[PDB]
Each structure stands twice: as C-alpha cells, then as structure tokens.
Amino acid sequence: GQMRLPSADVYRFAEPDSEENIIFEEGIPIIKAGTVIKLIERLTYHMYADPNFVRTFLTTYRSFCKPQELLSLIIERFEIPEPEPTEADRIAIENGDQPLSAELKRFRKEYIQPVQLRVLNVCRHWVEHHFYDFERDAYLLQRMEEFIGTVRGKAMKKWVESITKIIQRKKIANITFQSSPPTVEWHISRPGHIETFDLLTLHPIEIARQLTLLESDLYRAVQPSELVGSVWTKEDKEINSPNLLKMIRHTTNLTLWFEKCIVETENLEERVAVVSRIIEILQVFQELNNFNGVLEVVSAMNSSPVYRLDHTFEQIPSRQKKILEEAHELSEDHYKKYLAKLRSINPPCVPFFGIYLTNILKTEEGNPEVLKRHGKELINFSKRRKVAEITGEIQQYQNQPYCLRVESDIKRFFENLNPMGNSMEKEFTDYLFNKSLEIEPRNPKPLPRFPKKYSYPLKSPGVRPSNPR
Amino acid sequence: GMTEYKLVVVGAGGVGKSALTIQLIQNHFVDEYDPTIEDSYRKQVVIDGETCLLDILDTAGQEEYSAMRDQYMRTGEGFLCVFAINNTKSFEDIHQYREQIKRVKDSDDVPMVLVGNKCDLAARTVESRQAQDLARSYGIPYIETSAKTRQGVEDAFYTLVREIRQH
Amino acid sequence: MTEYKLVVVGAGGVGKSALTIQLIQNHFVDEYDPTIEDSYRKQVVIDGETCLLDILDTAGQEEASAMRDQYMRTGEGFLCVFAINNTKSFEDIHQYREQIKRVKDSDDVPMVLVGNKCDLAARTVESRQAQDLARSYGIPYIETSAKTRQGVEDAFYTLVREIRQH
Numbered sequence: 001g002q003m004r005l006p007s008a009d010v011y012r013f014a015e016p017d018s019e020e021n022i023i024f025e026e027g028i029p030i031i032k033a034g035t036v037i038k039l040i041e042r043l044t045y046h047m048y049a050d051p052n053f054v055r056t057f058l059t060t061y062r063s064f065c066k067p068q069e070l071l072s073l074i075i076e077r078f079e080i081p082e083p084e085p086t087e088a089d090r091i092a093i094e095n096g097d098q099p100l101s102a103e104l105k106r107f108r109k110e111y112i113q114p115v116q117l118r119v120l121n122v123c124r125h126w127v128e129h130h131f132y133d134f135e136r137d138a139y140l141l142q143r144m145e146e147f148i149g150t151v152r153g154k155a156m157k158k159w160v161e162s163i164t165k166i167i168q169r170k171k172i173a174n175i176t177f178q179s180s181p182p183t184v185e186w187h188i189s190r191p192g193h194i195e196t197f198d199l200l201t202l203h204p205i206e207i208a209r210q211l212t213l214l215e216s217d218l219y220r221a222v223q224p225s226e227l228v229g230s231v232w233t234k235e236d237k238e239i240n241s242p243n244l245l246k247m248i249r250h251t252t253n254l255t256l257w258f259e260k261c262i263v264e265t266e267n268l269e270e271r272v273a274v275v276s277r278i279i280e281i282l283q284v285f286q287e288l289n290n291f292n293g294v295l296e297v298v299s300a301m302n303s304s305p306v307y308r309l310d311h312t313f314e315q316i317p318s319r320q321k322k323i324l325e326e327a328h329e330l331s332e333d334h335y336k337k338y339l340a341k342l343r344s345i346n347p348p349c350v351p352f353f354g355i356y357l358t359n360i361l362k363t364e365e366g367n368p369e370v371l372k373r374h375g376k377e378l379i380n381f382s383k384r385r386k387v388a389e390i391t392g393e394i395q396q397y398q399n400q401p402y403c404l405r406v407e408s409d410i411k412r413f414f415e416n417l418n419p420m421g422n423s424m425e426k427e428f429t430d431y432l433f434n435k436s437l438e439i440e441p442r443n444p445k446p447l448p449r450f451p452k453k454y455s456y457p458l459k460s461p462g463v464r465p466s467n468p469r
Numbered sequence: 470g471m472t473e474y475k476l477v478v479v480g481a482g483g484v485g486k487s488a489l490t491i492q493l494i495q496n497h498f499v500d501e502y503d504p505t506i507e508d509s510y511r512k513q514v515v516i517d518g519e520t521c522l523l524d525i526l527d528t529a530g531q532e533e534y535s536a537m538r539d540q541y542m543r544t545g546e547g548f549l550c551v552f553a554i555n556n557t558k559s560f561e562d563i564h565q566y567r568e569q570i571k572r573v574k575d576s577d578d579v580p581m582v583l584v585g586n587k588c589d590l591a592a593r594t595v596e597s598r599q600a601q602d603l604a605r606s607y608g609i610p611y612i613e614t615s616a617k618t619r620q621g622v623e624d625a626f627y628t629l630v631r632e633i634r635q636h
Numbered sequence: 637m638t639e640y641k642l643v644v645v646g647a648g649g650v651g652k653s654a655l656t657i658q659l660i661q662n663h664f665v666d667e668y669d670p671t672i673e674d675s676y677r678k679q680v681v682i683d684g685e686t687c688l689l690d691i692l693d694t695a696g697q698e699e700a701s702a703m704r705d706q707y708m709r710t711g712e713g714f715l716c717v718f719a720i721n722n723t724k725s726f727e728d729i730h731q732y733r734e735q736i737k738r739v740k741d742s743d744d745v746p747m748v749l750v751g752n753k754c755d756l757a758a759r760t761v762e763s764r765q766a767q768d769l770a771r772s773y774g775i776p777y778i779e780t781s782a783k784t785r786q787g788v789e790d791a792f793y794t795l796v797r798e799i800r801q802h
C-alpha cells in the first residue's frame with residue numbers, strides 16, 4: 001500500500017489533492033493551476049523529479065509568491081515529521097528487542113529523503129541560476145545561508161556542504177574548441193589603423209564576424225529576470241532590463257549606421273558600391289547564423305530613406321537582389337520562414353530577440369493570473385509554463401559560443417558607433433529622409449549628379465575567406 | 470476567394486496596447502491566449518454582410534526596435550494608432566506615428582483609425598473631446614476601447630476595414 | 637526536429653556533469669559540486685538531421701541511489717560513465733546497466749559505455765577490459781575527456797544514433 005503521511009494539521013503538504021487546490025492538464029502530470037502549497041509540493045515531489053518544473057517555477061514564481069515567502073515555504077516543506085512506532089515495533093520494544101521499524105525506514109527512504117533532497121535541489125538551482133533574488137535582498141541571502149548551514153544528518157551532508165560553498169563562490173563572482181578560429185581578414189584598413197576604419201575599408205568578412213561576436217555577447221547576456229513580468233516595457237525598464245536594452249540599442253544603431261552610410265553617399269556609383277557591400281555583409285551574417293545581423297540589414301534596406309532609392313536598386317547585381325529578397329522573405333507571414341530556419345540550423349546562432357519579446361508580452365497580457373474554481377483562487381500555472389518555454393528557448397541558444405577571434409580595435413569601432421551623434425531620433429531620421437530626397441528626388445524632378453567622396457578603391461575583396469599557410 | 474486585409478497596430482509601449490488584438494482574436498468567451506500559435510492573429514469576420522479575413526500585425530513589446538518600424542509598417546493596408554487614455558505622452562506620440570505611416574506608405578490618405586484604450590482604473594488624463602478633436606483634425610475616426618471588457622474592440626477593427634473599403 | 641531524451645548515469649565524481657557542461661557550453665568545470673538532478677537542452681545537427689537533445693544529468697552519490705527509477709523511466713538512451721582512473725566506478729557500471737534493463741523492462745535499451753578522464757596518465761581501467769564489457773552489452777565504448785573535449789561529441793552523438801536506429 002501507499003505510505004501513510006503526517007497529519008495535514010501538523011504538515012500542510014500532506015493535504016489530499018482536490019480540484020479545490022490543484023488542477024492537472026489533460027508520464028508525469030502537468031499542472032494547469034494550483035495553490036502555492038500544492039505547487040511547492042509538486043516542485044519537490046517524493047515520487048519523481050521534475051527539473052523542467054524547477055526551472056519554470058524558479059523563473060516565474062515572483063508573479064505569485066515573494067522570494068521571502070518562497071524560502072519560508074520550502075523550509076516548511078523540508079521539516080517533515082517522522083511517524084511514531086507501529087504496533088509491531090511497540091511489541092518488540094516491550095519485550096526488550098530492537099524493533100524492525102519497517103514503516104519508519106520506508107518513510108525515511110521513500111518520502112523524507114527524496115523530498116528533502118528535492119528541496120535542496122530547488123535551493124541549489126535558485127542560488128546557481130536565479131541569484132539575483134539574493135543580490136537584491138541581503139537578508140534573503142542570510143536566511144538561505146543559515147538554513148543550508150544548519151541542516152543536520154548524514155544523508156544530506158554532501159549536498160549541504162556543497163551548496164554552502166556554491167553560495168560563497170556566487171557572492172564574490174573559459175571556452176575550449178577543438179578547431180582553431182579562422183584568420184582575421186584585412187582589406188584597405190590595416191591592423192592598428194583605427195582612424196581609417198569604415199564600412200568600405202574594413203574587410204566585409206571581418207565586419208560580419210566582429211559584429212557577430214558583439215551581437216552574440218549581447219544576446220548571451222540577457223537574463224530571464226529582464227523578461228518576466230514584461231519589465232522591459234514598464235517605467236523601470238532601464239533598471240530591470242539593462243542588458244536587453246543594450247542589445248536592442250546596438251541593433252538600432254547598426255541599422256541607422258547602414259542607412260546613414262547609404263544616403264550620405266551622394267554619388268550614385270559610390271552608393272551602389274556601399275549597398276553592394278552591405279548585402280555582402282548580410283551574406284556573411286547568413287553563413288554565420290547571425291539572424292539579428294540579417295534583420296539589421298533587412299530593416300535598413302526597408303527603411304523609408306533607403307527603400308525609395310530606385311536608381312540604386314536598379315544597378316544592384318541580380319544575384320544580390322535575390323539575396324536581399326530571400327532574407328526579407330524570412331520576416332514575411334509573421335516570421336514563418338525565420339522560425340523554421342532558426343529551428344533547423346546548427347548553432348551557434350544569434351536569434352532575433354523581438355519575436356520572443358512579443359510572445360512573452362502577449363502571453364502575460366492574454367492569460368489571467370488566477371483561475372477561480374469551487375470558490376477558490378488557484379494560481380494559473382499554465383500561463384507561467386508558457387512564459388518559461390520562451391525563456392528556455394532563449395537560454396538554449398545562449399549556450400553555444402562562436403569559434404571566431406576577437407579583433408579588439410574592430411570591436412571597439414563597432415561598440416563606439418554613434419550615427420545619431422547628439423541629435424534626437426526625429427531630427428536624425430528626418431535628416432536621413434531629406435538626404436534620400438536630395439540624392440534621388442521624387443519624380444518628375446530630374447536626377448542630379450554628385451561628386452565622388454571616396455579616394456580609395458570601391459571594389460569589394462568578396463566574402464569568401466582566404467587561408468595562407 | 471475572400472478579401473484579406475492586412476492591418477497594423479501601432480502605438481506607445483507599456484500601456485496595454487496588446488489587449489486590443491488579443492481581445493479581438495481571442496476566444497471571446499475564454500480569457501486565454503497562445504501567441505506562438507500559427508494564426509493567433511488571423512480571424513475571419515463578417516463586416517456589413519461581407520466576409521473577409523483580417524491579418525493583424527501587432528509587434529507589441531518591440532517598441533525599442535525603432536529602426537524596424539518602417540519595415541513593419543509597410544506591410545499594412547490600414548493602421549490602428551493606439552494611445553492609452555491615462556497616458557498623455559502616448560497621446561502626444563500619435564502625431565509622429567501618423568507622419569511616419571504617411572511617409573512609409575508614400576500617401577497623404579492612408580486608412581487609419583485613432584484608438585483610445587482604457588488599460589486600467591488609473592485616472593484618465595486624455596479627455597474624449599481632446600481625442601475627438603485630434604481625430605477630426607486628421608479626418609479619421611476615433612474609437613475608445615476597454616482592455617478588460619472588450620468594449621469598442623470590434624468597432625475599432627471594423628471601422629478600420631470600412632475605411633479601407635471606402636478609400 | 638526530433639527530440640531525444642538522453643540520461644547520463646554513473647558513480648559519483650566520474651565527470652557526468654563536466655561531460656555534459658562541456659557538450660553544452662564548451663566549458664570545463666573544475667569544481668566537484670555533486671549533482672542532485674540537472675537538465676539541459678541542445679539543438680544540434682547530427683548526420684544532417686536537426687534535433688533537440690534533452691540531457692538529464694543525474695546523481696552519482698550513493699545517498700541518492702533510491703531515486704533512480706523515476707529518471708530511468710523517462711530516458712530513451714543512457715550514457716553509462718565511469719572514470720578510467722577509478723576501478724570502483726567501472727565495477728559500478730553493471731549495477732546501472734541492470735537497473736536500467738529492469739525499469740524499462742527491456743534487453744535492448746540504447747546505451748553507450750563512456751570511460752572518462754582519458755586526459756589523465758594514471759589509468760587503472762584498461763581499454764580492453766571496458767571494451768570487453770561493452771561487447772557483452774552490445775554497445776559501443778568511447779573514451780572521453782571533459783577537460784580537453786576528446787571524444788565528448790562522439791559519445792553523445794553516438795547515443796543519439798543508437799536511439800534513432802532503435
């Protein structure tokens with residue numbers, strides 16, 4: 001038979017499941033809704049582990065439970081009473097014999113030790129992967145240190161001593177490849193001559209590689225704490241979502257830099273060379289699975305100042321028109337082809353983050369926090385699972401590093417890019433559009449001619465890599 | 470077959486804009502949503518006796534990708550310009566959204582509707598007369614909607630489709 | 637995208653977590669933090685087909701030995717890891733093999749035998765003895781180093797191929 005449990009009057013997590021406290025979805029069960037007590041019971045269940053549930057819960061719980069209250073509840077979960085001696089044990093003791101204590105030994109082995117170990121696994125994951133709760137609340141950290149540091153008894157000892165050390169290391173807080181990264185490529189600008197760096201003077205292969213390293217690092221730095229609760233859209237977004245915002249602002253700045261490079265090149269022949277070089281960079285982004293970079297280029301080409309430049313488009317080689325068109329097709333029909341491509345490639349990649357943001361925001365806005373059942377309010381956990389499925393997909397693409405060498409000067413050049421200067425956004429984007437009108441006026445105004453601005457060769461070195469011995 | 474209208478929702482972030490399309494496309498009568506579901510933004514409707522398909526683009530949450538607005542906007546035949554009635558800044562933003570739509574579509578007469586959205590019980594700061602005056606100055610309809618009761622939601626989208634049909 | 641549920645099992649300290657983190661992050665973990673249960677996901681193209689690996693990293697410490705049935709039920713394939721400088725961990729392999737067979741009620745569970753820490757010179761388990769055991773199980777034997785990456789992709793992706801051909 002099943003093990004008997006402590007009385008629900010002395011141990012709250014022994015209350016029977018009912019539709020008034022837990023609802024399952026239609027081989028472990030999937031929880032649709034429940035009380036916080038039932039969620040924590042199933043988070044630390046004696047019959048099975050649910051590591052995905054642990055991640056989901058620790059990512060999303062603050063929308064229904066405060067960090068201080070979560071710690072109190074898992075400490076309460078941990079402190080399980082042992083059963084009293086049974087009749088057979090009593091009779092043995094009355095005869096001066098050692099009791100078999102069969103029921104007690106089974107309850108320790110099959111209920112207490114698994115639940116306690118799974119409570120410690122929640123603590124371990126909380127400290128390792130959600131440490132911001134403790135960075136933001138020093139007293140919460142003190143309580144966790146005291147709880148872990150006072151667990152007695154040999155069965156938990158190895159993990160208690162380990163978690164103590166992990167906490168201490170987190171308080172004061174290296175990649176291997178088997179292949180070598182390819183050689184850094186140079187074009188007109190030579191190493192160390194940062195003052196000559198520009199769109200046409202750096203090697204287009206190396207522009208795409210260094211932007212991919214930069215954009216990959218920005219992508220990998222975004223934590224779920226910047227996303228849950230839609231906090232990047234709220235008044236405190238600069239406080240709560242700084243890595244996400246830095247990533248988006250880089251993308252915006254690069255898009256505007258591409259547009260500025262195009263429309264400030266007034267000579268038609270030179271501007272064709274500029275656009276052709278940008279489409280070559282897009283081709284290397286595609287080869288690197290840098291989808292953020294692909295869309296930076298696509299967004300620039302579809303901007304109002306660039307899209308209208310029919311005389312420039314006419315002179316772009318057909319094969320490059322096709323590269324740009326197929327890249328734009330990734331975004332059509334609500335990113336249908338992009339989503340399929342992302343799910344088919346071999347990482348490393350740099351996803352486009354915007355789709356994730358829209359899906360997290362709409363999941364949060366479109367589902368209720370609670371479900372009302374039998375007069376009780378239950379936490380709608382299905383909604384949190386959906387959010388954590390998105391943050392989990394984000395995290396899965398953050399693991400794989402690019403096997404590309406950083407060039408510190410090219411990296412600094414792109415980190416310091418500032419096409420808007422001191423201008424505000426409207427002033428700057430009106431400037432770009434007015435440049436577009438200047439260099440290719442609206443029909444029936446005639447097309448003017450403009451002098452060349454570049455003193456160096458416009459011929460691209462191409463995007464196939466070279467390899468000296 | 471039936472006409473498909475490509476509609477685009479634009480407006481300031483952080484003030485409940487996404488509730489408009491969610492409430493439209495939703496199972497009206499079950500408060501639930503999975504936006505990742507292929508065609509969670511397509512809806513067949515009957516407007517003035519004529520069946521059509523609405524394809525709604527709402528990039529809510531991507532407002533900081535400001536250089537992508539042109540590309541997103543060019544996909545649209547008609548636009549809902551949304552502000553929150555308790556956020557005066559979102560109302561003041563409307564002028565620049567409209568100017569950007571006109572530039573991207575290269576037209577002074579783009580089908581669009583102005584939508585004032587009530588996203589919570591915080592105090593209203595934009596009176597309906599102010600929004601009506603702005604809409605009249607642009608020659609476009611004004612619809613107010615609730616983010617919680619679905620009031621006005623159908624009117625906002627159906628009015629926009631009528632603006633497209635009568636363009 | 638086909639999804640594959642891989643489970644990494646073996647005695648405490650043999651390098652199950654280091655192997656998994658090297659596969660997932662290309663990083664070698666120097667610390668010895670005993671695992672309770674961890675899970676990882678990895679999208680990867682294997683033999684031209686994209687799939688999604690779900691990797692369960694399990695507890696080797698004996699204090700967790702009563703909690704294994706639950707993860708053996710869910711796993712589709714098992715990496716059975718010992719360390720080539722620890723003879724006791726090699727002798728522990730057969731206990732994992734037998735429990736997996738009992739739980740899944742099957743003589744034919746996808747498995748790979750992994751001899752880890754092959755970067756260390758002080759070997760105490762000879763390759764021949766491990767290969768003999770693998771042949772008796774009908775499974776491949778792959779020596780690995782979580783430190784240098786030697787054999788790591790081969791071990792995990794061989795297990796995927798075993799599940800695919802099951």
Ligand SMILES: Nc1nc2c(ncn2[C@@H]2O[C@H](COP(=O)(O)OP(=O)(O)NP(=O)(O)O)[C@@H](O)[C@H]2O)c(=O)[nH]1
Pocket residue numbers: 646647648649650651652653654655665666667668669670671672694695696697752753754755756780781782783784
């Ligand atoms: N030299 C060397 N050390 C290794 C290798 N793999 C793991 N180690 C080291 O061995 C120790 C234990 O590794 P770990 O991955 O934690 O082992 P585990 O099997 O997961 N232990 P547990 O069962 O308790 O979770 C760590 O100090 C780790 O750095 C390897 O291939 N080479």
Ligand SMILES: NCCc1cc(S(N)(=O)=O)ccc1Oc1ccc(F)c(Cl)c1
Pocket residue numbers: 275298301302306307308309310312313314316321324325326328
């Ligand atoms: N007639 C529209 C052609 C066009 C298509 C795309 S798209 N939708 O394929 O991404 C993007 C931009 C774009 O306009 C351009 C203007 C100047 C150029 F130098 C080039 Cl190359 C393209």
Ligand SMILES: [Mg+2]
Pocket residue numbers: 652653654669670671693694695696
């Ligand atoms: Mg481990």
Ligand code: NA
Pocket residue numbers: 555556557558594
């Ligand atoms: Na206001």
